[model samples]
Target: MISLIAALAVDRVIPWNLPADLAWFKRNTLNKPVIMGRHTWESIGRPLPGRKNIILSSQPGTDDRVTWVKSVDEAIAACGDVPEIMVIGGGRVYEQFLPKAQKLYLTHIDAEVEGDTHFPDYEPDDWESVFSEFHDADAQNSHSYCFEILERRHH
Candidate 1:
């Protein structure tokens, strides 16, 4: 399974496009396990219903159908026999897991966004770019973006 990650500035004001990227996420990750950070979980406000949701936290807690883990090793253990696990998250989670990731899906937006969090810089020499696609903003969308998939290079 491939791990996909994206940073989106969704307009919460627009009713029609509140979750502009949900469709893309659903299409790509249906029935797969999704791992996310507490902040990422709070952004959406709840479990994403239907898919197995795993939340990473150092604290202890429990929720219906949600598995809480403190570390990457524990998270991987929770995934059990699933062939693939998707790490969808905020900055800290990405920083922790990126080194162990076999593949990465990044969505680069054209517009500048004001935010307190940011994705960490990755060295080009360590990963191989395997896929890329550019998207243009339409009337409903304010920004254009590119989707890129990178695979780790093994010597």
Candidate 2:
């Protein structure tokens, strides 16, 4: 139920202490399929540990670690019996799946970032915060932020 559509935000980039949060993601999605856009995959340049890495690319697969597919639908199908499947995105992929995302993990950074990518727009009243955790800014983290799980409200 978590995804790349709206990932954690950061003030100082991945330059700070965010390993804890990334660890959280890895632990939660360890045995499941993680479908991400090619750009997202390119950023890492390698497969994530303990997760089935599925790249949304028409390009092709490079090795055993990757299971490249041309689209999200194909990626999900490739998951087979994996309990859960989630999409990790850069931009276009988020816009493609955010509408139907029932639950999302939003790591909120209290900083105005200077980036070309942005989250999709949604009404505040249309969602509810189900969980939250605050982390202090220290030597590791460049800025203080909170991690929240949001669920969409039903009419």
lDDT scores in order:
0.71, 0.70
| TM-scores, each model vs. reference | 0.83, 0.82
lDDT of 1 by residue, 91-122 (tens): 78888887777787766666554554667666
Alpha carbon deviation, residue 96, candidate 2 (Å): 1.1
Clashes of each: 0, 1
TM-score of candidate 2 relative to the true fold = 0.82
What digit string (tens of lDDT, one per residue) describes model 2 on residues 1-155? Answer: 43442454553221345666666577656777788888889898889877788888777777667888987678767878754567667677776767757766677776666575666655678788899999878776677777787778852
